[PDB]
Design a protein around this ligand. Sequence first.
Ligand SMILES: [Mg+2]
Ligand SMILES: [Mg+2]
Ligand SMILES: [Mg+2]
Ligand SMILES: [Mg+2]
Ligand SMILES: [Mg+2]
Ligand SMILES: [Mg+2]
Ligand SMILES: [Mg+2]
Ligand SMILES: [Mg+2]
Ligand SMILES: [Mg+2]
Ligand SMILES: [Mg+2]
Ligand SMILES: [Mg+2]
Ligand SMILES: [Mg+2]
Ligand SMILES: [Mg+2]
Ligand SMILES: [Mg+2]
Ligand SMILES: [Mg+2]
Ligand SMILES: [Mg+2]
Ligand SMILES: [Mg+2]
Ligand SMILES: [Mg+2]
Ligand SMILES: [Mg+2]
Ligand SMILES: [Mg+2]
Ligand SMILES: [Mg+2]
Ligand SMILES: [Mg+2]
Ligand SMILES: [Mg+2]
Ligand SMILES: [Mg+2]
Ligand SMILES: [Mg+2]
Ligand SMILES: [Mg+2]
Ligand SMILES: [Mg+2]
Ligand SMILES: [Mg+2]
Lengths: 177, 206, 262, 143
Amino acid sequence: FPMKQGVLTHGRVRLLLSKGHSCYRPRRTGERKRKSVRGCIVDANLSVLNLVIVKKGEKDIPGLTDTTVPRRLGPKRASRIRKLFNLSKEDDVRQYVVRKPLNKEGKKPRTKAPKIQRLVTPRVLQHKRRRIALKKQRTKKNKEEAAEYAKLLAKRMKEAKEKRQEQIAKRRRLSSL
Amino acid sequence: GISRDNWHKRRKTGGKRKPYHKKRKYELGRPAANTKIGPRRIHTVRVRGGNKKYRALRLDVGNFSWGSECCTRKTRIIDVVYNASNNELVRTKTLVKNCIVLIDSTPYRQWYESHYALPLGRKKGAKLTPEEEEILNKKRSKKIQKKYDERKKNAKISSLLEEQFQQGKLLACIASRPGQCGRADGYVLEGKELEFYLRKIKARKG
Amino acid sequence: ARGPKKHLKRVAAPKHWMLDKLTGVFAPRPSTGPHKLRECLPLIIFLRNRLKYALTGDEVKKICMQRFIKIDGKVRTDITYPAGFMDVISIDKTGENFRLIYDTKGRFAVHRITPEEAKYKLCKVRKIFVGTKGIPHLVTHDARTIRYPDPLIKVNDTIQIDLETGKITDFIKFDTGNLCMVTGGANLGRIGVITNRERHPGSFDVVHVKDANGNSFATRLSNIFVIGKGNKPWISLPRGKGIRLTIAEERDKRLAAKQSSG
Amino acid sequence: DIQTERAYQKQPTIFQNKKRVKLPRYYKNIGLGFKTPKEAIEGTYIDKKCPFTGNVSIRGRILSGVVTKMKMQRTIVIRRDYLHYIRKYNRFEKRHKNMSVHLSPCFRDVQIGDIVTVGECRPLSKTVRFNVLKVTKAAGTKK
RNA sequence: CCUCUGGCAUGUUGGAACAAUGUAGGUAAGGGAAGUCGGCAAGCCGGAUCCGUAACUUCGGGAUAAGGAUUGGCUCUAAGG
RNA sequence: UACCUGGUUGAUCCUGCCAGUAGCAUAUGCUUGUCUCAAAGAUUAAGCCAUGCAUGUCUAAGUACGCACGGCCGGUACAGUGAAACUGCGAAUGGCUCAUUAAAUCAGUUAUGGUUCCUUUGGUCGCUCGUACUUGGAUAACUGUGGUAAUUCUAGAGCUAAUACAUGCCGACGGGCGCUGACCCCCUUCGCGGGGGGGAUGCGUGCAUUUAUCAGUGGUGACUCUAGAUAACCUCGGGCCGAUCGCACGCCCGGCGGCGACGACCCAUUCGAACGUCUGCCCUAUCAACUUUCGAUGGUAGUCGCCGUGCCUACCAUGGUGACCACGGGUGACGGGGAAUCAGGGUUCGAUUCCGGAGAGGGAGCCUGAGAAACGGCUACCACAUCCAAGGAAGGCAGCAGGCG
RNA sequence: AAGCGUUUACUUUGAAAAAAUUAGAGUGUUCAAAGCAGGCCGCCUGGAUACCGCAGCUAGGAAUAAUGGAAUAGGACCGCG
RNA sequence: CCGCCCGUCGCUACUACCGAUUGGAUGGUUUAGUGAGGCCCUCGGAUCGGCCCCGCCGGGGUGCCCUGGCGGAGCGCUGAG
Ligand SMILES: [Mg+2]
Ligand SMILES: [Mg+2]
Ligand SMILES: [Mg+2]
Ligand SMILES: [Mg+2]
Ligand SMILES: [Mg+2]
Ligand SMILES: [Mg+2]
Ligand SMILES: [Mg+2]
Ligand SMILES: [Mg+2]
Ligand SMILES: [Mg+2]
Ligand SMILES: [Mg+2]
Ligand SMILES: [Mg+2]
Ligand SMILES: [Mg+2]
Ligand SMILES: [Mg+2]
Ligand SMILES: [Mg+2]
Ligand SMILES: [Mg+2]
Ligand SMILES: [Mg+2]
Ligand SMILES: [Mg+2]
Ligand SMILES: [Mg+2]
Ligand SMILES: [Mg+2]
Ligand SMILES: [Mg+2]
Ligand SMILES: [Mg+2]
Ligand SMILES: [Mg+2]
Ligand SMILES: [Mg+2]
Ligand SMILES: [Mg+2]
Ligand SMILES: [Mg+2]
Ligand SMILES: [Mg+2]
Ligand SMILES: [Mg+2]
Ligand SMILES: [Mg+2]
């Protein structure tokens, strides 16, 4: 059973663990489950204790220091390319993204670059033009409809005012009967 | 949990409903908010239909409308003094709908002295040497001075309100439901309801 | 049930779709849309049972999803779309236009329409709403919220909507003398002139309506859809023209016509 | 007369304390041709649940009954009296449903036996769903 | 049970020890009448408030039946002239 | 097809049953050649279950640096199929059973003017006056060290994306609209004064939320409706005003562009859900009074709730139901559409394929979600029960087959 | 034509009543139970109709059965102060 | 009428009833004690960041400002938890 942070005791406990907690992975959205974990403070009675070397000693160790393992994937966000290879906002990112070589048994040697997201392409700029063109279309439609309804309501209220003026003049001449 | 269901209780005939289903989720009750007076803390409950309710838990301010003058300002809640339901909800200071709180009358004092340019409160003999209240009360134009001189005929207030301004804090009624909305809004008591709640308070005082 | 139901049974489907009894346990639960469930006729039923352009559910799916069926001037792709009253089917490729008008009995009738008639439809308004800046709103029988209408259009009138724009072209007002198609009840599909309007506060107001052949009959006002000034409609009428000849006259007409056919 | 109880008793849509130099009271007609009584306009009472001067809306059904008990606070019990038909014995049986109805205090003099008319509304309490809309006096008893 | 006015000098002696048997108070793990003629002696319970109270019966009782719960100090609120 | 017949007597005429008579379901016997339909672990044990399966899902249109396959045209990123995993959605439908349940469910009926509602269709979506040629840091999948006897267990390290998670402005935008108003200018007047405009500067300036006030565009039988005006608030467990994706590829001289996909506050719409109104339920009096300061029936004020409401709390009132059968009990009782038998009435049945309800061994509590008090989700406890290295782990056939009883 | 006409029970009509079942129309499933099909040398057509007690809603009738009104005149009507 | 016929007693079988045993076993409702678990509130703060404060400086502006790297540390503030 794994060790997890902040339990702060010596023995083994049982916790309800959820999304965002460690030593647990949910299956359904919203699932919580009593799993049994081990506290922070340590003793002999465990198999594996994990260590992270945080300051290199003055002498080498062969298993850990001599060989080096590079990062496997190059960066993919455009500003992360910028802040890796130290770019401004004018130099082209796409020639500066890392590409990998490809060599195996019986196949052609290749190279492979990630499809970098968040670069500014003319399709993104076209969509940003399209939404504000659509906005001005919507205000033009709104002012057009409002003006033609204003003309129509002026005409209908002119009709109703002339109708009641007909009533008042007709019953004045009926009073003159 | 806490249930809100008629099926757990007797008929009109005093009978006994035996239930035909267990507790449902639309038959749900959650515990009381009991909004005290303190620096603002509001938790958010998500409710039926995915909406949000705002439990205040401790709460200091709220905008009160003094509506005979129609001035509505954000004000600091001083105290709970009267509650028509439960006197221990006065004894602990719990903000609920239609309870009587007290609020500091400084924004309404500022508005009255800036609109009518007459003092209220103001035990006579002192003048604020920071001089800003009298630069608010004096030195206007001869076009605007007739506007103030015609608005100062409608500038006499109720004496109950005025002694509340002189003491510095007003009686007011909470209108909103602070366990539901998250706010402690309401209105300043003036009038026959003010005299009603004042005689209630001093009869309780004995 | 712990939520909304998604399946609909074959026997529990509405009768005016005229589903049969022994194909399958189910009937297509129509998707939510502008028309009610018990007052619609879905697109799978319209293409499969009525027109016989499709044989199976896969065939009506591939017809509706190679983008050929154009309901109300718009492309509607799901096969369980509720095609309701006064909707206009535009079969583009095969070149037809249908208007889902009711029959002399309770059916929806396959009713072929010229394109110059099929570019409008007629809609009964259900509500007058006023939006946020004094903006009037019609709410028709098929969920159209139409902002800025004519102020002479009131709550039980009908409007002639142009389809590619959605705007009002003209309107008929609910008065005595105008026509009526009847959308609901035991008198479903009948056509007559409105004889009488009887006001019941709180209850459902009831309208007496008289057809061409001197038969007068009542109907609640929610089931009444005016379709023109006087006797003159603003759409076409189906075969029989909403008369409901009796069962004796139907017997006499079928044996007369088919002994004349031989 | 007024302000019996703990809180202040006022009508919620009226603003009564506007600056001067008798209160107006809120009242409405409930529809269906029910004449609002003169004591509702001329009164001084408050009521949440009066159909004429309060926050209820008479909808649905409009029934009748005879006043049979008035022992409660601002609600009475009416006794709807009807017959019921058995398909076997072609006869009837006299049944009844007592039901509690909120009687507004604008109907100021009513004695038991009077045939009142009630209207369905918002459920005012646990077993109360109607209001007395009009009161017709019992036969005789004009003195 | 403790105290004030009043009264007295511990009831026909004092001192020093703190052994057995006593006489008179107590306490006891674990078990709970296995002791003995017999629960002898001891022990349990115990006041008040709120509930709850069976058989039987002369209808009066049984009855505080049995069985439960609450109880302090302090800061208050409400009702009773 | 509105049917009777044998039997008490030595014989008769009657009341009266017993027994014959015809169905109709369940079992059971003996018998069985064709063919079309078709019920089938309901009754007893809503008793217990070995095993396998019963809810998963990819479009041009959210993420694609797994050579996992692959095309060449490169070097100006990503051709294109594409497992995996994050994200989104569904898993609340369906199916099974009928244990509970007797004004309860349910049926007809109306109401929500007393509420919520993913979705789909239609509105809305520069109305706000105050790095945008695109902002940030983590994480799975992948590599690499593992642990346990064992689980759909998961840990420490490296990397890396978003329509995940966050942050956040530019454009409209040049002023209008309401306040405050320094001041400016004119007519009358001995004159204070009155009347009249213009107005720099500063404050507020959209939809939604919350409060209060004023007036009375469009509605209903009826609003405290809708819409207007005003004074303010706007929740840091924050409400909107788009930092998203795919096809074609044109036009002004960098800027304009069309067709869509997704998502969003609100308003309708659809499917509904949810409480309510009137009326209707079988046997039982060897059940005649029941309910109440432990809510019973009302009032006033709150709390909670999605809403109305004794739903709950506080303080008052002493009510409420009952021979017109309450209350208590029983049911070999889920309700209805319906089935059998029938002259007319009736009598009996309805677990059973459609609708409504209830439940997942018994009770209870919840997370996620628009919708669940979900059990082919979780946590306890009781009964049961599986694996084991004895420390632990895992379960729910009244789903389909099948097994025991 | 809009608003009003003591009220119920009864009667008649209209509305609204979910399909399935039941009754029943059409139709040579080879007949029948069934099924909503099918027919003519592309066209022709079907996929009806009735019943659905009780309660509720609407409009006619006014016999029967109830109920009322004017009797300490607190009565209609008609105009006047 | 040598007909029929009724009861006790004696034998046999069967079904019930009363019956000391404060009898026995199963259900169901429930007063009262103990009470797991979830949810809410009041705390808590394992851990993880962010901003300031200095020292050493590289890239840039008219000795102050911003950056990018190295550290150190008050934990001065601050956020999640
Ligand atoms: Mg009969
Ligand atoms: Mg002594
Ligand atoms: Mg002595
Ligand atoms: Mg002596
Ligand atoms: Mg001992
Ligand atoms: Mg002991
Ligand atoms: Mg012995
Ligand atoms: Mg002994
Ligand atoms: Mg003794
Ligand atoms: Mg005794
Ligand atoms: Mg005999
Ligand atoms: Mg014989
Ligand atoms: Mg027999
Ligand atoms: Mg053969
Ligand atoms: Mg079984
Ligand atoms: Mg289901
Ligand atoms: Mg039973
Ligand atoms: Mg049962
Ligand atoms: Mg059934
Ligand atoms: Mg059964
Ligand atoms: Mg069912
Ligand atoms: Mg369930
Ligand atoms: Mg079982
Ligand atoms: Mg469950
Ligand atoms: Mg299962
Ligand atoms: Mg399920
Ligand atoms: Mg099956
Ligand atoms: Mg039917």
